[PDB]
mmCIF file of N, CA and C in Angstrom:
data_model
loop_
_atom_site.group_PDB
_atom_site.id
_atom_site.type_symbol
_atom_site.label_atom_id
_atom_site.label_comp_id
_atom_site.label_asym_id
_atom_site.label_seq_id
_atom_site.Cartn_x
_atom_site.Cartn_y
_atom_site.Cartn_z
ATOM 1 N N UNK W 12 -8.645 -4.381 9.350
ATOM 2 C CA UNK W 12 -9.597 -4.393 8.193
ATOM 3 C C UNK W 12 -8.884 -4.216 6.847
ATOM 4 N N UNK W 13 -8.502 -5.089 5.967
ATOM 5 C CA UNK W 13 -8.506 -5.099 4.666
ATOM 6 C C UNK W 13 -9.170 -4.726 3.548
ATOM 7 N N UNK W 14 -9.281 -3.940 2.845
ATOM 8 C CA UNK W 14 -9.893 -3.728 1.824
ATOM 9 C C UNK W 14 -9.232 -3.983 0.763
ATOM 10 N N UNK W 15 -10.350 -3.916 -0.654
ATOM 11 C CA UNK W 15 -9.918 -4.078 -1.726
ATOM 12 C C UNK W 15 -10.925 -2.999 -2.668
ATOM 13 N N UNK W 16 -10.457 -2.816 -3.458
ATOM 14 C CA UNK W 16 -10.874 -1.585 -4.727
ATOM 15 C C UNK W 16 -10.864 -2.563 -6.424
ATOM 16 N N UNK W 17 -12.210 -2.433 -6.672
ATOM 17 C CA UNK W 17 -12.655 -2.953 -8.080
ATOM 18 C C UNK W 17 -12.055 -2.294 -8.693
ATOM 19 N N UNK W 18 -11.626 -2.902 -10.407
ATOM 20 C CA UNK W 18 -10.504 -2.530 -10.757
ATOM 21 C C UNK W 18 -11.492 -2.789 -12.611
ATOM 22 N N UNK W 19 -12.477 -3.827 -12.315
ATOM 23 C CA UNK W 19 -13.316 -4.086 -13.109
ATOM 24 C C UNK W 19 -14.880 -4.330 -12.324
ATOM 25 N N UNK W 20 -15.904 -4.326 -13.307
ATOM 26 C CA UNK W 20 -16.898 -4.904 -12.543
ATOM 27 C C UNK W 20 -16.557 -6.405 -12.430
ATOM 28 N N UNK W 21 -17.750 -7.046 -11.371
ATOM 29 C CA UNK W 21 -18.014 -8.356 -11.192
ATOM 30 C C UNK W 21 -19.256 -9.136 -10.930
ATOM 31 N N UNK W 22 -19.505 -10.034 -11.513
ATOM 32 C CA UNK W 22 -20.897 -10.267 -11.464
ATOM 33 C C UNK W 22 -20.452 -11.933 -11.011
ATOM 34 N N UNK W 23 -21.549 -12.595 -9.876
ATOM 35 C CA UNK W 23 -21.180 -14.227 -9.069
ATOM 36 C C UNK W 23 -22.106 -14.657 -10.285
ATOM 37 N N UNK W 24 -21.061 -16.050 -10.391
ATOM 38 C CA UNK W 24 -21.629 -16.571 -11.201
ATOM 39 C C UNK W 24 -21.695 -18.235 -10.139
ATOM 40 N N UNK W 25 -21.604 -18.163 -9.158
ATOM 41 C CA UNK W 25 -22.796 -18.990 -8.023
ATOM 42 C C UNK W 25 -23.046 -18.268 -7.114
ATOM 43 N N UNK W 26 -23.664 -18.987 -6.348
ATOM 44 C CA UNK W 26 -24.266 -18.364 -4.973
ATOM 45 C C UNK W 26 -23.752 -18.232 -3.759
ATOM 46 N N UNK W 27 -22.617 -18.294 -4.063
ATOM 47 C CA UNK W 27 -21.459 -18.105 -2.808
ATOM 48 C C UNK W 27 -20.609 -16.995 -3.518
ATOM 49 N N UNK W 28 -20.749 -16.168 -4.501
ATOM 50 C CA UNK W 28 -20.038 -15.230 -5.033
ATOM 51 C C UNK W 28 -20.061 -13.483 -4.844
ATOM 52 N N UNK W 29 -19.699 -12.678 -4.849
ATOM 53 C CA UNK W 29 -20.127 -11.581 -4.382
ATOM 54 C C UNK W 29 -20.552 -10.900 -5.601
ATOM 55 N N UNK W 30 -21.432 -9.252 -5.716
ATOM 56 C CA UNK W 30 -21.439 -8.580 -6.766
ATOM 57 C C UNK W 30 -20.935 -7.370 -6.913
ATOM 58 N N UNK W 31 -20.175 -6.472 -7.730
ATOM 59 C CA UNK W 31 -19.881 -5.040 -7.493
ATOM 60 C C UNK W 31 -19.567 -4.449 -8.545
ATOM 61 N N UNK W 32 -19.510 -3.011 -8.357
ATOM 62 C CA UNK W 32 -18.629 -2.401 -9.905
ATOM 63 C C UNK W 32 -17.717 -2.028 -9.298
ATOM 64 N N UNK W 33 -17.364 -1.562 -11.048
ATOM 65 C CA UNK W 33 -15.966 -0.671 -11.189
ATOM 66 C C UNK W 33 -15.422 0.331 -9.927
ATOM 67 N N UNK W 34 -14.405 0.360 -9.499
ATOM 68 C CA UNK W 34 -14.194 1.123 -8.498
ATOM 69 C C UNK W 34 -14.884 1.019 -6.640
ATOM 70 N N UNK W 35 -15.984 0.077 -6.620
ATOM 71 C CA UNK W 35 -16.428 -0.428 -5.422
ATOM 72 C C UNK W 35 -15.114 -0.708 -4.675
ATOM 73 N N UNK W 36 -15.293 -0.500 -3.334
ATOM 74 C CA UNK W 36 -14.676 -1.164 -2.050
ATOM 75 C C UNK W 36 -15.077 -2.617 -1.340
ATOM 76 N N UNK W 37 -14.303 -2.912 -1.385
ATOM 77 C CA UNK W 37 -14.331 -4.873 -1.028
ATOM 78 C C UNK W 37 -13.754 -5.039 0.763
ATOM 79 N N UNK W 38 -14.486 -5.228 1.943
ATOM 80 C CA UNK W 38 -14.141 -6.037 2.622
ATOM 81 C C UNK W 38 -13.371 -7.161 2.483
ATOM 82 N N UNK W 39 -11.947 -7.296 2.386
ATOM 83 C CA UNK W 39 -11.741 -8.482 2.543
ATOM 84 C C UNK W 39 -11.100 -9.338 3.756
ATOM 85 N N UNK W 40 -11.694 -10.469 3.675
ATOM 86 C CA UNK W 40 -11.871 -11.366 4.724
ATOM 87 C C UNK W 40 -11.509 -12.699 4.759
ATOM 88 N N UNK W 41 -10.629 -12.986 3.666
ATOM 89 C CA UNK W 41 -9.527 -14.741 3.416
ATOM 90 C C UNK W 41 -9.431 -14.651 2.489
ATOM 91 N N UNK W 42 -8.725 -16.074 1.730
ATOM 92 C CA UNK W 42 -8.078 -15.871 0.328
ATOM 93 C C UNK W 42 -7.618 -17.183 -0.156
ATOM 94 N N UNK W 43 -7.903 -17.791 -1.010
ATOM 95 C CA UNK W 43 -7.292 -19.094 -1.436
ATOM 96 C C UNK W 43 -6.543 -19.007 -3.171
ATOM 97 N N UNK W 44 -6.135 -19.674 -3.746
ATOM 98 C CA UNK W 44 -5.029 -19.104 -4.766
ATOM 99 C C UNK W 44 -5.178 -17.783 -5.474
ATOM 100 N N UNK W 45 -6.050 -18.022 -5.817
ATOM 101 C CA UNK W 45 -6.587 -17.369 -7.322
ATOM 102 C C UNK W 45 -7.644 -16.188 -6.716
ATOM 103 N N UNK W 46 -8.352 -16.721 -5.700
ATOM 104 C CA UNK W 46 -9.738 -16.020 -5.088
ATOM 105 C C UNK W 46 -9.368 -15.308 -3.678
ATOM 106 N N UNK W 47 -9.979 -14.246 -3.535
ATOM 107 C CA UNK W 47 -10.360 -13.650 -2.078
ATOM 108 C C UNK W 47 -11.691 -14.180 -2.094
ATOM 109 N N UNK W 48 -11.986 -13.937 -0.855
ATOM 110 C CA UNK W 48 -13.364 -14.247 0.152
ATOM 111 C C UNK W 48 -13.238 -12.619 0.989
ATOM 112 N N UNK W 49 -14.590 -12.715 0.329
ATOM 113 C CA UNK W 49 -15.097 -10.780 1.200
ATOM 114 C C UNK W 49 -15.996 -10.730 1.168
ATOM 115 N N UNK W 50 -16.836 -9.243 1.878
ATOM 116 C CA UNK W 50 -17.717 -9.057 1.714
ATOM 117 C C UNK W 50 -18.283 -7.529 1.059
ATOM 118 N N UNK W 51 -19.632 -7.930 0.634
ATOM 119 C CA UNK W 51 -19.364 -6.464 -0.232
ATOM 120 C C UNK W 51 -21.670 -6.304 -0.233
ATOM 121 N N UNK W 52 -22.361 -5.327 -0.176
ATOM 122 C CA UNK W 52 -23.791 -5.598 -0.480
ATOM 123 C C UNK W 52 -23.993 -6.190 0.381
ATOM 124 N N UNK W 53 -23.885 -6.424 1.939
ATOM 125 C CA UNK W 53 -24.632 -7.021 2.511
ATOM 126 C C UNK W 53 -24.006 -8.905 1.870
ATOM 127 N N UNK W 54 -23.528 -9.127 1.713
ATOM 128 C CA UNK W 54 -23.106 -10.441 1.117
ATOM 129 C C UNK W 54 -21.870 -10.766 1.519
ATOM 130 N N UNK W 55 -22.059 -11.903 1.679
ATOM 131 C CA UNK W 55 -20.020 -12.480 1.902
ATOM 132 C C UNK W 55 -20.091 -13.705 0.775
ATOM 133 N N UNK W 56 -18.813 -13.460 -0.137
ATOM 134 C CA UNK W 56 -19.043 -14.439 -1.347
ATOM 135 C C UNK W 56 -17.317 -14.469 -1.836
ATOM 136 N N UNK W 57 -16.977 -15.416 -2.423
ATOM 137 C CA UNK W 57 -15.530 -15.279 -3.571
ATOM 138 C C UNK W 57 -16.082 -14.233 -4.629
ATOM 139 N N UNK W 58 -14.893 -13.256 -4.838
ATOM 140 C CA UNK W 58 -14.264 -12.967 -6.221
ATOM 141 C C UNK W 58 -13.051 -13.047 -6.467
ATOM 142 N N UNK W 59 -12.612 -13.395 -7.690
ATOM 143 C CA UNK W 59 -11.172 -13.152 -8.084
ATOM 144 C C UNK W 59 -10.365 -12.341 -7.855
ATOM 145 N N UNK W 60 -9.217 -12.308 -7.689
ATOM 146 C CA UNK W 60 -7.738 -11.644 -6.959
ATOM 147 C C UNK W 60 -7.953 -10.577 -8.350
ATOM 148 N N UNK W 61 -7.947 -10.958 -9.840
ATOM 149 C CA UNK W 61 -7.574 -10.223 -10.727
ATOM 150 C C UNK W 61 -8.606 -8.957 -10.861
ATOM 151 N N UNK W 62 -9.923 -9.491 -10.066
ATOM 152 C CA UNK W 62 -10.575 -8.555 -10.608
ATOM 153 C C UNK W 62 -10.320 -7.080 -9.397
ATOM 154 N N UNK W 63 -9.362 -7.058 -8.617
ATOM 155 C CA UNK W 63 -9.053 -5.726 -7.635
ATOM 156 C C UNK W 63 -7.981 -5.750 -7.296
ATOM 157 N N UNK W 64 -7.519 -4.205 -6.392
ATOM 158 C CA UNK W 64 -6.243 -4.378 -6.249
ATOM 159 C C UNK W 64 -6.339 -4.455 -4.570
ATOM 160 N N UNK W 65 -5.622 -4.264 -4.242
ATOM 161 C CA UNK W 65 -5.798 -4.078 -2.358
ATOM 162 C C UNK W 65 -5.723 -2.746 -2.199
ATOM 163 N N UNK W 66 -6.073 -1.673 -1.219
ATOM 164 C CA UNK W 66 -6.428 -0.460 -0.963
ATOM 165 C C UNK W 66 -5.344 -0.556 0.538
ATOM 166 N N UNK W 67 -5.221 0.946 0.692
ATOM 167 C CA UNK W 67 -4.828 1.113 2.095
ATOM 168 C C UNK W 67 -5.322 2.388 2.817
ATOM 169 N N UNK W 68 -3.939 3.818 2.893
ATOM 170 C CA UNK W 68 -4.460 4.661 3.393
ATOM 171 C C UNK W 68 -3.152 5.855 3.091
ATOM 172 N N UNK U 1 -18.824 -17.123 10.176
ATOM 173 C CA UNK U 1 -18.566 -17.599 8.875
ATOM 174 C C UNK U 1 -17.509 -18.456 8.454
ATOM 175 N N UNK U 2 -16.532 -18.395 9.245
ATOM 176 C CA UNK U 2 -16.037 -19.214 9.076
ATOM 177 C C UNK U 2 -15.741 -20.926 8.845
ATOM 178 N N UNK U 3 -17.328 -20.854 9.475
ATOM 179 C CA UNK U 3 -17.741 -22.351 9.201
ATOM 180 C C UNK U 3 -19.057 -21.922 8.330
ATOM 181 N N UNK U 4 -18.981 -21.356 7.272
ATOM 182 C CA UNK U 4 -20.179 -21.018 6.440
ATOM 183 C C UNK U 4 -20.293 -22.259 4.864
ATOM 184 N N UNK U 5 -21.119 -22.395 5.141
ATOM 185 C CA UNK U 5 -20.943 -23.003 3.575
ATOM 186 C C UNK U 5 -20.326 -22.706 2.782
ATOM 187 N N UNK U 6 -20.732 -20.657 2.114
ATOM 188 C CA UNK U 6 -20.357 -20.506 1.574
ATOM 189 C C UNK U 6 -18.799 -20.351 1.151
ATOM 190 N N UNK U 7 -18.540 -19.773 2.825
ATOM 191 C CA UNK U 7 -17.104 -19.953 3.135
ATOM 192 C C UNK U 7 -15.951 -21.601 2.652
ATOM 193 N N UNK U 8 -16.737 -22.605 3.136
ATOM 194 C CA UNK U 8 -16.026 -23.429 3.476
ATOM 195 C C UNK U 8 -15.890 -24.575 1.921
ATOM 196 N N UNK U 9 -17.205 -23.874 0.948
ATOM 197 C CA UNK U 9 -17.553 -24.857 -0.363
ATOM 198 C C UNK U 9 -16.322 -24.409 -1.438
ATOM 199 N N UNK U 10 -15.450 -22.925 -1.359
ATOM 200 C CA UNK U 10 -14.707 -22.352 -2.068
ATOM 201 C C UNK U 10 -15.665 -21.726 -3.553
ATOM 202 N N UNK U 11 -14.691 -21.297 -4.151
ATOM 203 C CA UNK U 11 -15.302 -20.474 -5.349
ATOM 204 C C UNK U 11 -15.629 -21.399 -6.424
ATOM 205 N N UNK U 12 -15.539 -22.583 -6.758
ATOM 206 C CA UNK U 12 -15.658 -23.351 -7.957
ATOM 207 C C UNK U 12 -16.902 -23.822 -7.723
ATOM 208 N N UNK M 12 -1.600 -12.908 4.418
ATOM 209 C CA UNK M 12 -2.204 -12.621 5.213
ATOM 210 C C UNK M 12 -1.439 -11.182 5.647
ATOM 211 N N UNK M 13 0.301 -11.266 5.556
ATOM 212 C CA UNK M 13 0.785 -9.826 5.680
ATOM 213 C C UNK M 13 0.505 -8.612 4.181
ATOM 214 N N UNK M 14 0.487 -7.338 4.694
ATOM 215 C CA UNK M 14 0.437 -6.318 3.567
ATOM 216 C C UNK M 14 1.488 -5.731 4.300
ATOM 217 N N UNK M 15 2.081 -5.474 2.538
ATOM 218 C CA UNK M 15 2.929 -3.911 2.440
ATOM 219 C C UNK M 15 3.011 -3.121 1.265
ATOM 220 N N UNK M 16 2.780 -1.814 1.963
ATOM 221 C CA UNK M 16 2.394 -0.764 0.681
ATOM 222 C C UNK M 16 4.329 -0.566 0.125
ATOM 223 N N UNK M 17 3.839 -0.026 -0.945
ATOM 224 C CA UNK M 17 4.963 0.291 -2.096
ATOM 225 C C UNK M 17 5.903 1.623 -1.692
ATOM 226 N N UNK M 18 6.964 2.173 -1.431
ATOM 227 C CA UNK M 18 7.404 3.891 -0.897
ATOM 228 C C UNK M 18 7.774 4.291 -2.027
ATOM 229 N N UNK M 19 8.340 3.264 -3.106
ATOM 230 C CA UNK M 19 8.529 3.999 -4.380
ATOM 231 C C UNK M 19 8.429 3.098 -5.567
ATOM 232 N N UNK M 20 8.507 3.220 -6.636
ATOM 233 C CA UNK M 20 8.062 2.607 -7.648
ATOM 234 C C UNK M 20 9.096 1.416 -7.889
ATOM 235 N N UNK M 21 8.541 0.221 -8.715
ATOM 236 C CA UNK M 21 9.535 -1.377 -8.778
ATOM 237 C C UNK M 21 8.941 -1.279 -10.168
ATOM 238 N N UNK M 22 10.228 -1.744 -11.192
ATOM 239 C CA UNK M 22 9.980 -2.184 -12.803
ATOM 240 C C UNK M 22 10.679 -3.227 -12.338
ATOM 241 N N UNK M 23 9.628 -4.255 -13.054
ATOM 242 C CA UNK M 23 10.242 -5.435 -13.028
ATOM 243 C C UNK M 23 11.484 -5.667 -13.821
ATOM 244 N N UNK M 24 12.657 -6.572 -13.544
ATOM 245 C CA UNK M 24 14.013 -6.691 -14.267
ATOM 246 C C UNK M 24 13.827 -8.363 -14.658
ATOM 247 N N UNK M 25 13.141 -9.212 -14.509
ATOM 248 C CA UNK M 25 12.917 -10.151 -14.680
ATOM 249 C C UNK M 25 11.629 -11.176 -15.068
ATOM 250 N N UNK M 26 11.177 -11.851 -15.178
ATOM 251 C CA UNK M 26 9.965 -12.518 -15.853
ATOM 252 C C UNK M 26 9.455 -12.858 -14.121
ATOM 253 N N UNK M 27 9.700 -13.128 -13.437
ATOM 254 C CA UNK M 27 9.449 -13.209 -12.140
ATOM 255 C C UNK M 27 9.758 -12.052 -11.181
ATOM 256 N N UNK M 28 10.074 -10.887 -11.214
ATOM 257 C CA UNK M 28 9.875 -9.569 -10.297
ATOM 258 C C UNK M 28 8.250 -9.296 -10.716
ATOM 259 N N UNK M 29 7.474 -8.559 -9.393
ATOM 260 C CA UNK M 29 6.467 -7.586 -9.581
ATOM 261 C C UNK M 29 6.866 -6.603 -10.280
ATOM 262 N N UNK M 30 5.748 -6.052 -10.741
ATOM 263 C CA UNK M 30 5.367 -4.386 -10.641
ATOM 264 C C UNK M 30 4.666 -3.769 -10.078
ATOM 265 N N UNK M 31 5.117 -2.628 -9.513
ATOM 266 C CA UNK M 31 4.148 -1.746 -8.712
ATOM 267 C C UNK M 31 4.252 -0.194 -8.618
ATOM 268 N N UNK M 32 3.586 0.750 -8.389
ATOM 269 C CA UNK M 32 3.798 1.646 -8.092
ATOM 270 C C UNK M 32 3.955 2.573 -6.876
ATOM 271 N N UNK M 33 4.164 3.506 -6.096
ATOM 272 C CA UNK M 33 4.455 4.197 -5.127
ATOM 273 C C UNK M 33 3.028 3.842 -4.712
ATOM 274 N N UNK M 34 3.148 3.820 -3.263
ATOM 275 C CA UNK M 34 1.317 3.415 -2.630
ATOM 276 C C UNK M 34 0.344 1.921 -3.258
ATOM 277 N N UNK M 35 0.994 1.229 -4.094
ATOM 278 C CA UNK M 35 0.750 -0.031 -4.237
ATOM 279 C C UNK M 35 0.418 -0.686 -3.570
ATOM 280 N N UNK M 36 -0.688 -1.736 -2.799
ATOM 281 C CA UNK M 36 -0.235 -2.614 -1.910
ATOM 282 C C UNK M 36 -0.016 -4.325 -2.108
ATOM 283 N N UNK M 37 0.733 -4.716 -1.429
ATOM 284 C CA UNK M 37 1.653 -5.852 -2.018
ATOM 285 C C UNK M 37 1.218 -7.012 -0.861
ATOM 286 N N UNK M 38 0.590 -8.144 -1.301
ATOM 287 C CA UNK M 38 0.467 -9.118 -0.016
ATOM 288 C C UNK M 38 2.240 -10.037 -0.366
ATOM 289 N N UNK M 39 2.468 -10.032 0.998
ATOM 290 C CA UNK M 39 3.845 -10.642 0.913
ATOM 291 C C UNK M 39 3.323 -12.056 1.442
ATOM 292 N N UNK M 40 4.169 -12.759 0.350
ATOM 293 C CA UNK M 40 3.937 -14.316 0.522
ATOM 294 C C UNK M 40 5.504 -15.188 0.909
ATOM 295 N N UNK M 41 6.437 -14.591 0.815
ATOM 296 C CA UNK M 41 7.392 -15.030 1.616
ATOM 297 C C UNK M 41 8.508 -13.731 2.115
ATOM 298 N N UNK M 42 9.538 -14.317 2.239
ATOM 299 C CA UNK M 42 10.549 -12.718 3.095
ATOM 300 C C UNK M 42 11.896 -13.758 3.016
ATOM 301 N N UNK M 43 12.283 -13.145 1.822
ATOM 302 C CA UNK M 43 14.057 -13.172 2.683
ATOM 303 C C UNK M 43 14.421 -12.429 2.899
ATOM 304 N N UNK M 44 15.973 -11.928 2.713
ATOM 305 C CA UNK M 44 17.417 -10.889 2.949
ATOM 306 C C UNK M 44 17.282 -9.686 2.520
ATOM 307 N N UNK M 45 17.391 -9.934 1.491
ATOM 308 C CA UNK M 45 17.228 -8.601 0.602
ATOM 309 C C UNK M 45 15.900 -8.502 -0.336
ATOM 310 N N UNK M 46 15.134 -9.632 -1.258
ATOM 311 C CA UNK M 46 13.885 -9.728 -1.592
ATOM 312 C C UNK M 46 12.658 -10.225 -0.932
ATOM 313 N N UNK M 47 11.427 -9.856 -1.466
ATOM 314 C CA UNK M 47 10.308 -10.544 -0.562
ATOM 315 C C UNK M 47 9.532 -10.773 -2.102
ATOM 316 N N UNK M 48 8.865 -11.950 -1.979
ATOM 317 C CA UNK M 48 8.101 -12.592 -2.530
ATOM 318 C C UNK M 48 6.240 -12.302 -2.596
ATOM 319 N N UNK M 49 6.008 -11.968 -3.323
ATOM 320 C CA UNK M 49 4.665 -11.341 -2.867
ATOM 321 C C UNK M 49 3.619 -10.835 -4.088
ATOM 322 N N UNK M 50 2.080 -10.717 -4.096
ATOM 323 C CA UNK M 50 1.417 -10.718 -5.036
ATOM 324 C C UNK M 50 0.495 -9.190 -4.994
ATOM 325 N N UNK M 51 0.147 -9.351 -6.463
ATOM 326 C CA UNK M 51 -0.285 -8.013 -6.548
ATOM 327 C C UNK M 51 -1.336 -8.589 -7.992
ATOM 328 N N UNK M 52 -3.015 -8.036 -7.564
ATOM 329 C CA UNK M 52 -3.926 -8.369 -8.764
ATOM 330 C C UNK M 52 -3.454 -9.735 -9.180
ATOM 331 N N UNK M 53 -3.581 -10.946 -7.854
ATOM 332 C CA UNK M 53 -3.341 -12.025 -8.476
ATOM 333 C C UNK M 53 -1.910 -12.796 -9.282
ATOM 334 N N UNK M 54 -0.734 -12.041 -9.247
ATOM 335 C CA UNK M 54 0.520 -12.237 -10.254
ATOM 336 C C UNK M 54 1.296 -11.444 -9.054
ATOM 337 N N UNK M 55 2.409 -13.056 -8.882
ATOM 338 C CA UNK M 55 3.239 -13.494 -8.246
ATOM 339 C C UNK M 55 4.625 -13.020 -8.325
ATOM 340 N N UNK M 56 5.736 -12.264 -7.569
ATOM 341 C CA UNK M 56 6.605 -12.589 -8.321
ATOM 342 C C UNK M 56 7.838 -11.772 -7.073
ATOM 343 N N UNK M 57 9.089 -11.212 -7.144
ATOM 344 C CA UNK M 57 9.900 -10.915 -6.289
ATOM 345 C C UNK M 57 10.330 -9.159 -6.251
ATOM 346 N N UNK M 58 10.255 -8.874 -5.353
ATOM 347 C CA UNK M 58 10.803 -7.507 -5.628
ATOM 348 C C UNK M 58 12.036 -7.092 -3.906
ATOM 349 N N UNK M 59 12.191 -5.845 -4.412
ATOM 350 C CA UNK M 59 13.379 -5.624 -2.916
ATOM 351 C C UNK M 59 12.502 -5.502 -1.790
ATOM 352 N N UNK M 60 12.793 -5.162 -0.458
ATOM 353 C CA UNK M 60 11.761 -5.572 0.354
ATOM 354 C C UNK M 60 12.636 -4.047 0.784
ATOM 355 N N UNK M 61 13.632 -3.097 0.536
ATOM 356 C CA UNK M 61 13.621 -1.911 0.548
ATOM 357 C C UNK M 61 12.979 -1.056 0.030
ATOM 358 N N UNK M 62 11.715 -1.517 -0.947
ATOM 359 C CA UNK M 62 11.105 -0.728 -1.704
ATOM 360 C C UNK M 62 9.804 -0.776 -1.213
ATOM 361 N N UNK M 63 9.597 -1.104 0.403
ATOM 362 C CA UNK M 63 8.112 -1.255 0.503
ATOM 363 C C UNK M 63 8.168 -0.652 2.380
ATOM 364 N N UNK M 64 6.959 -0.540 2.862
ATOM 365 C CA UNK M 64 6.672 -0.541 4.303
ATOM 366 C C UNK M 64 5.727 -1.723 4.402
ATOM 367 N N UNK M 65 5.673 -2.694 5.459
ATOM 368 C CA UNK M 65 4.632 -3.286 6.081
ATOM 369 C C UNK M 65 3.506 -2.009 6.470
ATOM 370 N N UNK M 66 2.234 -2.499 6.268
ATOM 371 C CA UNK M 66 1.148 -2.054 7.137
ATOM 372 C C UNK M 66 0.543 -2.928 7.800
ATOM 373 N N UNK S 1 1.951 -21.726 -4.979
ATOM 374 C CA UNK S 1 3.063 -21.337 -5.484
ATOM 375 C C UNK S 1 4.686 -21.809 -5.098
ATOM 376 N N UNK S 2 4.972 -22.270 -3.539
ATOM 377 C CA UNK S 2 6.118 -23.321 -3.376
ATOM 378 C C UNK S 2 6.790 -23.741 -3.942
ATOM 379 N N UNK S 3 6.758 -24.894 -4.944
ATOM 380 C CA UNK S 3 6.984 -25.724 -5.494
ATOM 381 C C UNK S 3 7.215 -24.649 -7.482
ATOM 382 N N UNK S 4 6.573 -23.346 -7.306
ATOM 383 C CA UNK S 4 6.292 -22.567 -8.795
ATOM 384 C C UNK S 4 7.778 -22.100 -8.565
ATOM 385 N N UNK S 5 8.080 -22.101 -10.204
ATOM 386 C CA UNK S 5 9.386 -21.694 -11.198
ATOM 387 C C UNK S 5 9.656 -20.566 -10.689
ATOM 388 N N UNK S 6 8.901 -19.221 -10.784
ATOM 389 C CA UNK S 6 8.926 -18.336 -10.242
ATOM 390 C C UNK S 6 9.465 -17.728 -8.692
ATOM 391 N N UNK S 7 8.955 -18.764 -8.222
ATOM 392 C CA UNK S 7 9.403 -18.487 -6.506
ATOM 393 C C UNK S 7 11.020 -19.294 -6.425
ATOM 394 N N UNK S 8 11.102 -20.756 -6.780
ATOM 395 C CA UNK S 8 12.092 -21.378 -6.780
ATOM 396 C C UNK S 8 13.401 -21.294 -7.393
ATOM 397 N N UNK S 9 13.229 -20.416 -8.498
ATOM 398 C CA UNK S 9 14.199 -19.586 -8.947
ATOM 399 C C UNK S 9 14.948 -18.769 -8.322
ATOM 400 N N UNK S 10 14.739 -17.994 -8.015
ATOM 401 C CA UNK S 10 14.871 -16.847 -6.822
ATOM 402 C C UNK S 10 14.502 -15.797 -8.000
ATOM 403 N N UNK S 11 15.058 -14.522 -7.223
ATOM 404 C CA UNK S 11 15.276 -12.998 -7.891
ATOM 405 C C UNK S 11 16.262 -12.526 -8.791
ATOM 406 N N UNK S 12 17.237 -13.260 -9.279
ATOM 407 C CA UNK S 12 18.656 -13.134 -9.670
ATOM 408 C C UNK S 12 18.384 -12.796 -11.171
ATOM 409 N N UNK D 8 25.226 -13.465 9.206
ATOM 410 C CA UNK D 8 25.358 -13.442 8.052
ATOM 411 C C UNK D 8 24.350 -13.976 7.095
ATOM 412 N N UNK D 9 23.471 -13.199 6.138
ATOM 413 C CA UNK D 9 22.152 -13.207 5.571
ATOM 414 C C UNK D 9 22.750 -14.242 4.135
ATOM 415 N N UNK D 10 21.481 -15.131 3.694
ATOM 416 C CA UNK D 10 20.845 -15.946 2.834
ATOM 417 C C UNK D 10 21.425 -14.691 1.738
ATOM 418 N N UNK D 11 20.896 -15.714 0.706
ATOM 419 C CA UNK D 11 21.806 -15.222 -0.788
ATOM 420 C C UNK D 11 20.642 -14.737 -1.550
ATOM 421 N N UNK D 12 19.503 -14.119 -1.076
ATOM 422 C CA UNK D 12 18.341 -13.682 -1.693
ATOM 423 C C UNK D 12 18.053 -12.915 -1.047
#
């Protein structure tokens, strides 16, 4: 299990996008350049790489 | 999901 | 798809090294000898691969 | 990134 | 004997 930690808020700006704030925890679950694919709210959507960092333990 | 739309349409 | 956290801190020395700090985590996008290639918040770039653990 | 300045450069 | 990187 991967996670990720908001670093800013984020708000989808389509409907395949996820939503969260500042400091939220991100499921993440793939990744293409620029974007992860996670899930976060009951939702699985892209947000941007810039907007988190990766988490561990 | 992996064969999800949302998955498979990307972020743009 | 691999992670590795940071054991101690990397200043970048070049326009292409990361930065990171102790407990950082770093997706590694390639691996040589002595550096590994790998991203952090999206920005790409090289650091020692003595300065990290796989998780 | 492959083919990017950054990677193809090396670390030096 | 290791690559030059």
């Amino acid at each position: 299990l991967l996670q990720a930690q908001a670093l800013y808020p984020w708000r989808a700006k389509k409907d395949n996008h996820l939503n969260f704030n500042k400091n939220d925890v991100i499921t993440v679950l793939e990744q293409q350049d620029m974007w992860w694919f996670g899930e976060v709210q009951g939702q699985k959507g892209w947000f941007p790489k810039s907007y988190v960092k990766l988490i561990s333990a | 999901w992996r064969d999800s739309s949302g998955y498979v349409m990307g972020p743009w």
